[PDB]
Amino acid sequence: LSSEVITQVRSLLNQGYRIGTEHADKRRFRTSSWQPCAPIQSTNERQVLSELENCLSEHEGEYVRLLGIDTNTRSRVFEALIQRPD
Amino acid sequence: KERRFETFSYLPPLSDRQIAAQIEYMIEQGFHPLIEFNEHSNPEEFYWTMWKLPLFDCKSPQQVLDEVRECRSEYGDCYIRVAGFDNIKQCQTVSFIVHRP
Amino acid sequence: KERRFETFSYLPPLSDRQIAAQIEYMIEQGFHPLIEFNEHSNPEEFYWTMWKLPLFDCKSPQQVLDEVRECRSEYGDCYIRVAGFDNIKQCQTVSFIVHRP
Amino acid sequence: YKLTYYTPDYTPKDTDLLAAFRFSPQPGVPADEAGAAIAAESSTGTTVWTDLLTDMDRYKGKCYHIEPVQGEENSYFAFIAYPLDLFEEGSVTNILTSIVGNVFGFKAIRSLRLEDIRFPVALVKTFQGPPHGIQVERDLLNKYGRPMLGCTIKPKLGLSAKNYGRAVYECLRGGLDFTKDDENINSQPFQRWRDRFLFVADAIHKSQAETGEIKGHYLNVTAPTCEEMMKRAEFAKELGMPIIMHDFLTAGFTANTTLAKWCRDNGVLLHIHRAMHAVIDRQRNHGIHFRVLAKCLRLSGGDHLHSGTVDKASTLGFVDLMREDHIEADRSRGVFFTQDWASMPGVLPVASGGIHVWHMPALVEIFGDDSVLQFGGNAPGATANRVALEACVQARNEGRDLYREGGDILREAGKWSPELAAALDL
Amino acid sequence: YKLTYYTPDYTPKDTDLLAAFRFSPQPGVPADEAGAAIAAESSTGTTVWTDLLTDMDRYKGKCYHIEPVQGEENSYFAFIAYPLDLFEEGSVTNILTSIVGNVFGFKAIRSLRLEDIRFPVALVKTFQGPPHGIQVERDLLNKYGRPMLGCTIKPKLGLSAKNYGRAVYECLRGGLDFTKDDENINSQPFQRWRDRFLFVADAIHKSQAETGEIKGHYLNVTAPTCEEMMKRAEFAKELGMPIIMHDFLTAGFTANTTLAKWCRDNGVLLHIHRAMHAVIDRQRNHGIHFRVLAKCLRLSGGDHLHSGTVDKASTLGFVDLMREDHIEADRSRGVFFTQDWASMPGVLPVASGGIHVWHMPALVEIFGDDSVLQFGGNAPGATANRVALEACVQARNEGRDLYREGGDILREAGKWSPELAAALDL
Amino acid sequence: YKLTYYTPDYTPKDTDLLAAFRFSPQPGVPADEAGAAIAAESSTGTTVWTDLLTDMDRYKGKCYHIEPVQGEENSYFAFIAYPLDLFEEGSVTNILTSIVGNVFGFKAIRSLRLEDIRFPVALVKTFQGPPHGIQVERDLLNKYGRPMLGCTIKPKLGLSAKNYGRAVYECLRGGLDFTKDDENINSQPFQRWRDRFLFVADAIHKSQAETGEIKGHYLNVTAPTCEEMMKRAEFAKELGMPIIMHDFLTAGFTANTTLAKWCRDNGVLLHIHRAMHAVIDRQRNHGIHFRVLAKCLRLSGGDHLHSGTVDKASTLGFVDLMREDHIEADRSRGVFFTQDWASMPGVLPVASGGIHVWHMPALVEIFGDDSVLQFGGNAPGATANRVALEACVQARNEGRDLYREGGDILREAGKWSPELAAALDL
Amino acid sequence: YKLTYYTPDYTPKDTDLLAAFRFSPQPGVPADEAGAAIAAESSTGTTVWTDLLTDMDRYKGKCYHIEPVQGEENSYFAFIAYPLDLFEEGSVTNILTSIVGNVFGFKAIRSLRLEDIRFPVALVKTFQGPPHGIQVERDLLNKYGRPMLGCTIKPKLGLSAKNYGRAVYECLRGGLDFTKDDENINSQPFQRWRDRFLFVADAIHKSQAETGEIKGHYLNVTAPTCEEMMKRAEFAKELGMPIIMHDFLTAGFTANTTLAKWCRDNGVLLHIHRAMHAVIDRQRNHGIHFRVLAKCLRLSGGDHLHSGTVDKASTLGFVDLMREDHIEADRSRGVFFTQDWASMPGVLPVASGGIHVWHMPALVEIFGDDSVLQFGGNAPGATANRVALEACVQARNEGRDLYREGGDILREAGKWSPELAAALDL
């Protein structure tokens, strides 16, 4: 994980926002086709960060996009493209 | 007479080796093949007769060759085409004759 | 005879107090009170004439009151109307008569 | 189905079309697998050689949340996301077909109800929308400062055209802003549409002449065919009438959208009625909730809609789903989703239902400035109604709480007002 | 209510419309007083000064029978009769709004469901009816002595219009008689309407050329507005498309009536689907029942109508209602009165939803030649479909009872039909 | 200014539009205030009484990023976001008028060049976009897996219609698919447009007859007047012409968009030309960069577009930008943001300007199969060109690096192609 | 190329077309050969077989004069002649593509411009030219003895319809002759075009009633499509307006030539805005100078044109080009060629940009009577601005020098005018 993503997820968690991730290959990515990733059911920063890095490792060489979720509103509040295949 | 066709027609009649090379590129491209035949060939006529399915669980060219040779044996007076299609792209990426009567 | 107008026109002629109170209303909700007149009243005539501004730096009702008194002094033979705009909502939530010749 | 149509983790995109279910699965059917199915039968329907020439994954309904219904048994809340591409541009009928067309028949679900849909700002923009909206409509009418009163001419039928213009004449001239046709008045043989329209137009002309304020009547043009609609609407536009009537339920969304696009082209307002409304949202166990319809209509386009008399919670939920530009997601109000709208002009709700003139203080405190209130009848009665409105408004602008002192205000208005006294007595 | 409305001693006339409701009163509300209320909410609603200017009794809908439901408690039928003057001529929408426009919402009834209508002759014959009629339809396709075959392309979405034609073509060439566009496919970004139409027409013509048999596809013409739908349909006519597909519930009836009339003028078969009917009719106790909808549509006009995969008795009941010229009252099949159409032609029922071709012999024995069926997929696949049809019909004709002999027929047929041999192994 | 317009803390929304300016301020004007002044210019310009009747904040361009250009002095990028209400739906025109209506005319910036825009999906959804798309164009033309060959008719003027169709035929029969009307040819007195249309039509038909390729000619329809452009357009479809050509710069955007829409209604491909562009883009330090123009057109709608003979990297950037559905921000290729289309279809790129067919392999590699190459003219020459293309694509299929082996390929192809051998000899 | 395209001894025929190029070649390239290349690229481009089938020479762009720029290095002036044949009739667009279609892509010129064109009188007469002309305008409006005054309404966006027309009324009543939109303001979400026409017409008619002077606003009818623009302009005439607005760089020349024909046919004034002119004129090195565009536009047809606040010689040059029938060549003023117009009427200049009423007496000096002054604003300000207009004209007519006495005129006028005193005190 990069410093700038770490500081992002920090800010996200501090507000009380949940964490989600979505993955897709370079073709899927082109077609704006994302897929669900395994749940990060933890509000602790360490556990979130560890599960993010595990998910990144899971999907080597595929686009990964990080997001911010307000559970009360059930709606998106932030978009961000964290990783790319190269 | 001077009758050509869509793709690779102006090169020498494509031969089993070069068919194999082209089939291989099609395979590693990941586009699941389709073969197709007819009695005649009309541009204004969009659709030909596919070879009873498209091939989806394709590992080797040599099976595609066997099928083409079969569909010659049944339709030796018809034209046989190979077509390749990207789903993700939603674009027909390959379409070239492999037989003439 | 019985000519009406759009809001409060039915009611008895608004005395100063109720005009003030409604100015107040506009003030809490930030409807800066816009004073306009016409020499007659016909529904087809969308547009009337302003009293030289809308009163954006109104800290009190009495100032707009006193304006309308000036206006009556100069065009007492005319009708006077007052409006308030929700620039945030871009909506005219207010228009009503405070004078008649 | 679960393994491909149930995506608990799935975060629904800004551009998605989000849909909120309340379903009750048949015994033996788990909630999760019920939601998966509900997803599947609404978008795909289920190894045909045709499928692998396609991107199935790209168009799938991703059911991303299921949650049990509070304080009730055998009912769960499923949220399904749908790509924006799944639905045709300009077409309410399209999204309706794609959403609420087939999954309604899926036997395994005992009981099924879609409740909300998040209309992404993008698919919002696309539509002609309403023809004038709240504020432009108020301006065209010159009417500000109070909700727009309305009265239903009676009897529903039988009246001659000439008498139908007598009735409009009285009702409007008493002081009332518009008068509405009965939905069962279109061309009927005792009253032919052209004569109705002519006569009414005369009557509004006179009434507006002698009061000097905007008058209109919701002259229904619902005709069996587009051509006939268009003819009655054109000839109405020759008459200087500010508004018409269309029954979007019983006419249809397509007819409505045509009419509205014409009206926007034509500078004439648009009224809607909801005949059969109950047929779709009444039961507590099945249907689509009236909010999504009001939202759909505003989408398709209209300047006026009925919302009833006054559940109040979700009532004002949909009032807000048809008035504001921005509303936050609120469960308790029915607003299952957040709704951004790119400044699309809002719509004016039409309260109705024999509104019981004395009930009006709460009605106004509910509906505020921006609304239309409609009376299920004589010129003094409208005089008293107008009086009372102005007074109630007046008191609300004072800061007094209409709730508490509604009878007291109506009273205060009563002593100088004969006709208001004659009414309050009744 | 029970005093004026409720006329069990009244004689209904041939000039009057009847409506059938299965209604369960709210507790405290008796059966009779509820049936009167149901009469009231739909005819007159409920004193003003316009009342005495009219003859009120001229314009009252009359309930003339109540009885409790067999095998159910507190459920009763209010049989209700109406004048002829009430309605606009030839207006589905008008009638709908007259009857069902206010009755569904009144609290006094817990689960009302509109079961069946009886349209008087004089009213019935003001329409155009279905654009040709089963007999002319069958003459135009030139196909006799057997039901017809539709297939709905799969998968629903992502297919290129080029693939979409290519799947059509396989469908028809293997011996199908129709492909059907899906109700959702109207202009999606991944297929725009016009390309699709062009490629379907080319595919139809080439399938015709190879096969030697007339071919038709169900081109969707539901379009967001009247102008799109008009253009679209014109374009299809330009390609000589004999048949089209419209959705009527979301689109409504006004637009379907326009399309039917235009098609009358232009020779064009009108296939129909019922998308969103499951909203309105699935629930047993509340809603409106599909035969009403079918009867309304058949007034408006449509060559085809879907009626379900399949109560088998109520199914044939309203099947009959849509095919034959005159039907009698049959409660065992759900038919409640005796109807006359006075020479307005029939509409084909269509079967869908996994018709399972080893269930084919039951399908024929249920309906027979005068219907259409729809399979859920290849040229060989459609050839086996075809072979099964033709063996089934043959065996029917021979006097062999299908019901018992199915799997033997299919067998025998498969012995000489390798393609049917595969379809039976699967 | 910088206080009011420059907010480095603001996050751009998906609902906001972005504009990239490579700006060098006038001496004495700091970069930050310079960006402030730019932001002020393009939306608001910069008191009056009217000003406090609105919400300035709702209508405020925001610059959230300024940075000095690497390896340049006094040069910086202003990235300025823009709300979702400033513009009208579906009008390139209004856009350019808002962004570039006066910003270019300001004093403080010595040169300003608009590098990039980023449309919000909401606006992207409101146009019609390209009539068909790359995929659908390839479907109509039935040609797949390679780029497209076009040749322009020389000399640009003087040729008689008879001559001009001779040359057409020869270019086409020799194996080129497309023929280009040199830009200035519209109706010149030596060549009346209508006689040109007919002769092309009859040459293309007969070419198609001999060759057994679908042909197409590029038919410039750009007209003095809207009526005239339309007429010539009807008469082009009336001969079954599948493709036409128009100018979006010189003729403009309202005409192009009207033509695209009509084409959409009439099933005709629409090629574009870029004429007058290099008054706007040649300057690296002032004007507009062609990625913006392309992007605007691809909103407007067009099948093809010129993109140059070939910066390589920036080429690829805006190339992939006009073909690809979603693109990432990358500065090396000149793409400053991450974009999505929400499924608006692609445009083929076009190159021209003396393509030197022994340069073909690099051209195929850099472009690929989705492009069209346009060549500055005999049937043998077209034969050689087509051959060299077919050999190149084959070889690329083989996995042979094009760059290294182009010359050996061409030679091997020529050893059996006397046409190509001769082409090589020169 | 020089031996083909450099003819120093060539006399241009009056039937030719002369275009003046400022150019800086690449190092090494001689100036004469560079200008030969610039000639060749546009008239012929460049060998092919077809070329000898025509008269090469007849279709050539002849460099007959080259000189360096006085007091400048690596710069020169080219004059090129083009035969009348090469061009279409009535197509400004054709002109722009021939002259400036591709030449600014030619590599060897480091920088290029076109300074001026001389349109042969023959080629002139094919265009309709301005719809009415200065004199016909000035008669129909009735306005004499002064230049005209305009107030661009502010704020550009956000303003509601109702408020919009309010402010139009105000400012118009103050004594201003017209009002404009910002070029940006046609149908933004906050504001719909049709309602805005309707409001504006009410305001104008009220102003004209009360003031007793022809009032008008500049009605931006630019629309995404020729159909829309036609629509909006037809509508605007229905209401009885005298003038409209439209924008040529943005929307397109063709749409202009259309709109000018239609307004010519329907007796409506046309006003023009020049948004993006900066993107073609600003720099001193590369673009097309504004004068050329103004020349082209008056060809196309218009009644007003923005011309800046006000190099002063250039301003006076092209305003006179657009004003007078005959102009004599003047390189100090930048008029490269003698021009005639065979009495084709002129166009009204427009200057705007917060014109500083203190500088207004200079502006009357510079421009002369036949002009329009726009003002980037309330009823009293508009009165003070009119009375200053008076006072300055009157003084001019007294024989007092405007430039020397501007301050004395203004103040003396203000001694009797509170509104002008107030203005001056700012």
Curated annotation (Swiss-Prot), chain A:
Paired cysteines (S-S): 37-55
Induction, per UniProt: Carboxysome size and components vary with growth conditions. When grown in ambient air at medium light (50 uE meter(-2) second(-1)) there are 719 units (both forms are included in this measure) of this protein per carboxysome, the numbers decrease under low light and high CO(2), and increase under high light (at protein level).
Protein's job: Functions as a scaffold protein for the assembly of beta-carboxysomes, initiates carboxysome assembly by coalescing RuBisCO (ribulose bisphosphate carboxylase, rbcL-rbcS). Produced as a full-length (M58) and a shorter form (M35); both forms are required for correct carboxysome assembly and growth. The short form is more abundant. Despite its strong similarity to gamma-class carbonic anhydrase (CA) it does not have detectable CA activity. Beta-carboxysome assembly initiates when soluble RuBisCO is condensed into a liquid matrix in a pre-carboxysome by the RbcS-like domains of probably both CcmM58 and CcmM35. CcmN interacts with the N-terminus of CcmM58, and then recruits the CcmK2 major shell protein plus other less abundant CcmK proteins via CcmN's encapsulation peptide. Shell formation requires CcmK proteins and CcmO. CcmL caps the otherwise elongated carboxysome. Once fully encapsulated carboxysomes are formed, they migrate within the cell probably via interactions with the cytoskeleton.
Portion held of the full protein: 225 to 310 of 539
The gene coding this protein: ccmM
Family: Belongs to the gamma-class carbonic anhydrase family.
Post-translational modification: Protease inhibitors do not alter the appearance of M35. In isolated carboxysomes M35 is 4-5 fold more abundant.
Gene source species: Synechococcus elongatus (strain ATCC 33912 / PCC 7942 / FACHB-805)
Subcellular location: Carboxysome
Designated name of the protein: Carboxysome assembly protein CcmM
UniProtKB/Swiss-Prot annotation, chains B, C:
Pfam families xrefs: RuBisCO_small
Other comment: The basic functional RuBisCO is composed of a large chain homodimer in a 'head-to-tail' conformation. In form I RuBisCO this homodimer is arranged in a barrel-like tetramer with the small subunits forming a tetrameric 'cap' on each end of the 'barrel'.
Protein name as annotated: Ribulose bisphosphate carboxylase small subunit
BP GO terms, sorted: photorespiration; reductive pentose-phosphate cycle
Stored PANTHER family: RIBULOSE BISPHOSPHATE CARBOXYLASE SMALL CHAIN 1, CHLOROPLASTIC (PTHR31262)
Highest rank taxon of the organism: Bacteria
Keyword DNA damage: no
UniProt GO cellular component terms: carboxysome
Keywords tagged on the record: Bacterial microcompartment, Calvin cycle, Carbon dioxide fixation, Carboxysome, Photorespiration, Photosynthesis
Family: Belongs to the RuBisCO small chain family.
Compartment(s): Carboxysome
CDD domains: RuBisCO_small
Curated annotation (Swiss-Prot), chains D, E, F, G:
Lineage, uppermost ranks: Bacteria, Bacillati, Cyanobacteriota, Cyanophyceae, Synechococcales
Post-translational modification: The disulfide bond which can form in the large chain dimeric partners within the hexadecamer appears to be associated with oxidative stress and protein turnover.
Induction and repression of expression: Carboxysome size and components vary with growth conditions. When grown in ambient air at medium light (50 uE meter(-2) second(-1)) there are 853 RuBisCO complexes (RbcL8S8) per carboxysome (measured using the small subunit), the numbers decrease under low light and high CO(2), and increase under high light (at protein level).
Main localization of the protein described in the UniProt heading: other
Database matches in PANTHER family: RIBULOSE BISPHOSPHATE CARBOXYLASE, RIBULOSE BISPHOSPHATE CARBOXYLASE LARGE CHAIN
Name of the protein in its database record: Ribulose bisphosphate carboxylase large chain
Keyword Disulfide bond part of the UniProt annotation: yes
EC number: 4.1.1.39
Keywords attached to this entry: Bacterial microcompartment, Calvin cycle, Carbon dioxide fixation, Carboxysome, Disulfide bond, Lyase, Magnesium, Metal-binding, Monooxygenase, Oxidoreductase, Photorespiration, Photosynthesis
Modification N6-carboxylysine occurs at: 180
Single GO term (MF): monooxygenase activity
Catalytic class of the enzyme: lyase
Quaternary structure and interacting proteins, as annotated: Heterohexadecamer of 8 large chains and 8 small chains; disulfide-linked. The disulfide link is formed within the large subunit homodimers. Isolated reduced and oxidized M35 binds holo-RuBisCO (RbcL(8)-RbcS(8)) but neither subunit octamer alone; RuBisCO has a higher affinity for reduced M35. M35 binds RuBisCO via its SSUL domains; the SSUL domain binds close to the equitorial domain of RuBisCO between RbcL dimers, with 1 M35 protein per dimer. Colocalizes with RbcX throughout carboxysome formation.
Residues binding Mg(2+): 180, 182-183
Cofactor note: Binds 1 Mg(2+) ion per subunit.
